[PDB]
Design a binder for these strands. Structure first.
Length: 112
RNA sequence: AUUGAAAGUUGUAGUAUGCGGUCCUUGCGGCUGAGAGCACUUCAGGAGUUGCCCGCGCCAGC
């Protein structure tokens, strides 16, 4: 009632339990098996290098002994046609997990 | 709603700043498209042909 993120994405309270599962679930993101079959070889993974140049007070630069921040790192970039799948059980938003229905007047009305 | 319930391996980072593919170099020197050659030799603008035939300078004039 007082929180919205805890309602939709669940939460956990080790003090007294009160576990509520997430109402929205998602799967991994894989390239489709058709793409994998049709490429067979090829890397489709590129290691691109990026630098961080740090000019000194006038114009100077150092590698690892002047205390400056000048490095040369690398990052992996991928491609391909990926597959996604999500399931949103939004029908339970605002209804307590333990009491899906109230059933007080002999009708199974939702316990909102 | 199950070894279960919530859970970014994440946020900042120029593989940069300067550098003439440049300077010298004749596709040049010598070379007759030249020498011999009748557009010549034989040819009538020629033969025949009337500038013809008839014709009052005329009659009256002191």
């Amino acid at each position: 009632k007082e929180l919205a993120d805890a309602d939709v994405h669940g939460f956990l309270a080790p003090k007294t339990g009160r576990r509520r599962v997430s109402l929205v679930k998602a799967s991994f993101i894989l390239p489709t098996e058709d793409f994998i079959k049709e490429v067979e070889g090829e890397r489709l993974i590129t290691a691109i290098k990026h630098n961080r140049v740090d000019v000194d007070e006038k114009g100077a630069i150092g590698s690892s002994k002047e205390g400056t921040a000048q490095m040369l790192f690398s990052r992996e970039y991928a491609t391909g046609l990926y597959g996604f799948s999500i399931v949103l059980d939004l029908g339970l938003v605002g209804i307590p997990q333990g009491l899906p229905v109230k059933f007080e007047e002999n009708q199974p009305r939702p316990n909102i």
